[PDB]
Design a protein around this ligand. Structure first.
Ligand SMILES: CCCCCCNc1nc(NC2CCN(C)CC2)c2cc(OC)c(OC)cc2n1
Ligand SMILES: CCCCCCNc1nc(NC2CCN(C)CC2)c2cc(OC)c(OC)cc2n1
Ligand SMILES: C[S@@+](CC[C@H](N)C(=O)[O-])C[C@H]1O[C@@H](n2cnc3c(N)ncnc32)[C@H](O)[C@@H]1O
Ligand SMILES: C[S@@+](CC[C@H](N)C(=O)[O-])C[C@H]1O[C@@H](n2cnc3c(N)ncnc32)[C@H](O)[C@@H]1O
Ligand SMILES: [Cl-]
Ligand SMILES: [Zn+2]
Ligand SMILES: [Zn+2]
Ligand SMILES: [Zn+2]
Ligand SMILES: [Zn+2]
Ligand SMILES: [Zn+2]
Ligand SMILES: [Zn+2]
Ligand SMILES: [Zn+2]
Ligand SMILES: [Zn+2]
Lengths: 265, 265
């Protein structure tokens, strides 16, 4: 039986509920962490929040013209009229995206505000066969759609270095990390895929302190109903971890499986 | 109808501007912001581990809610209005629930963080420049709007030219200066018999230098009635050398006549 074990792991903090189900085993809803919808701090990071340091636009239309200074910070605004990344978006080396902010003359519903508007797609936390908890789509999601943000505790590299559990760490290449082990959102449950269907993009919204980009996941292709979400964790993860477990993504493209490791040797 | 929404879509509802009185254009000598801003290093304590928080598994309507107890009790009724018993002369500090609390985002202790719900309008008054009025009946105890602006130290406030849009945060001490950056509250006129009252509130941080200032109706308010709060004795002590109060109430405390009588007493 597939059991509904939490109606909403976000406790009403997201735009939509994110339920949890388990049809595999008796493991209950995960509660060894604190669900947070926005990045938190546990020591002073001194993020630059001075409103006069913001780059900002002078638009009073919907920010769809090429005169929008905010879009010009990434050559162009990369969102189409429905908030999706443009077909030609560089999915290998994404540019930094500067969304409109409180210093801009535009309205809060201009076309340069996708990530700040939050989760719209319907996601579900579920028990996988071989990779613990994972996150899947409850609906068809077109290419270039914003899925969720990678949220957690902002920490220094020095702090990352003394922590035991490094399995929920995202690198913001002083250098910083988001650690989602103790505090995080739905993204902490997203597994690694060697054939990923989401891509991380660095985004700026309410501040433009370049040390602390916010990490937004967008679909890299059309995603089918029921499909598990996954991003490429990267080489730093697997260089550390492959000595202890191998990739179970099951793809013919898999480059971190025991069979992939044996073939390289 | 000279502006559909002075807030540019930043609030839950629009705040239109009208002028049926004179030729004054919609005010634009300030920047509308929905949340307080900084123009110097303030380092508001955002450390999540410094939040007092509750362990409630209900809607935080019980007297056992720690957050309510920090506030003496929770003063919100089931509809988010202050209890008739609320102290309107010397209001307590309110601690709303927050991201560290175990409760849901829809708990009964989250009125101010949920934002504006009443229909307001920026309008041209007969004798007092711009003012703010209600476009609906508003029961006693309803959250109206927050006093939002630029956070400055007493030192910075001590050297600023225009002190007409300043609110003191007496806890070091600090001020909100709404002259250059501010929300709809910057346009609210002074009343010696006010229909709204300021309350110090804590939501996403509990840095005691920076309570957020939330106005609640002190009585039932009729449609079209102008909002007003009592600016207080410091304001009038400084300004009465230039002008005196024109609220016109029999309860007026800061007219030329009231001040003459004060000197007699
Ligand atoms: C540069 C940021 N420092 C970092 N550290 C990790 N682990 C440490 C390595 C030293 N011994 C303590 C843990 C990381 C581990 C990771 O995955 C296992 C990772 O993947 C995205 C990033 C890490 N970044
Ligand atoms: C301590 C907070 N210092 C402050 N200062 C004001 N004015 C100064 C007076 C000296 N020259 C510079 C400006 C204030 C003026 C105010 O109204 C006129 C006020 O109303 C709530 C608060 C003020 N708080
Ligand atoms: C950030 S967590 C993801 C959520 C995790 N599955 C859980 O149940 O909490 C990362 C951990 O999930 C597991 N995992 C993620 N992707 C994997 C993959 N492709 N193969 C094997 N294990 C994986 C590993 O234990 C990894 O250290
Ligand atoms: C914060 S502003 C209020 C909005 C202002 N009416 C405007 O048009 O921008 C405060 C100023 O409004 C005027 N004002 C507000 N209430 C008043 C009152 N009851 N009596 C006299 N002047 C008042 C004074 O010039 C005061 O310094
Ligand atoms: Cl710094
Ligand atoms: Zn623009
Ligand atoms: Zn814009
Ligand atoms: Zn902009
Ligand atoms: Zn793989
Ligand atoms: Zn509670
Ligand atoms: Zn609560
Ligand atoms: Zn609480
Ligand atoms: Zn008066």
């Amino acid at each position: 039986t597939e059991k509904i074990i939490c109606r909403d792991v976000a406790r009403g903090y997201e735009n939509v509920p994110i339920p949890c189900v388990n049809g595999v085993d008796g493991e209950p809803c995960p509660e060894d962490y604190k669900y947070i919808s926005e990045n938190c701090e546990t020591s002073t990071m001194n993020i630059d929040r001075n409103i006069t340091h913001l780059q900002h636009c002078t638009c009073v239309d919907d920010c769809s013209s090429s005169n929008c200074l905010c879009g010009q910070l990434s050559i162009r605004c990369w969102y189409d009229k429905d908030g999706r990344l443009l077909q030609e978006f560089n999915k290998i080396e994404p540019p930094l995206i500067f969304e409109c902010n409180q210093a801009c003359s535009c309205w809060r519903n201009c076309k340069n505000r996708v990530v700040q508007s939050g989760i719209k797609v319907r996601l579900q936390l579920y028990r996988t066969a071989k990779m613990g908890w994972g996150v899947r789509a409850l609906q068809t999601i077109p290419q270039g759609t914003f899925i969720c943000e990678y949220v957690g505790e902002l920490i220094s590299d020095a702090e990352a270095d003394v922590r035991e559990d490094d399995s929920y760490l995202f690198d913001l290449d002083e250098v910083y990390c988001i650690d989602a082990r103790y505090y995080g959102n739905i993204s902490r449950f997203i597994n690694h895929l060697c054939d990923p269907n989401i891509i991380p993009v660095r985004v700026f919204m309410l501040h433009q302190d370049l040390r602390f980009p916010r990490i937004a996941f967008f679909s890299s292709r059309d995603i089918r109903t029921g499909e598990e979400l996954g991003f490429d964790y990267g080489d730093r993860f697997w260089d550390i971890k492959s000595k202890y477990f191998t990739c179970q993504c099951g793809s013919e493209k898999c480059k971190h499986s025991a069979e992939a490791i044996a073939l390289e040797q």
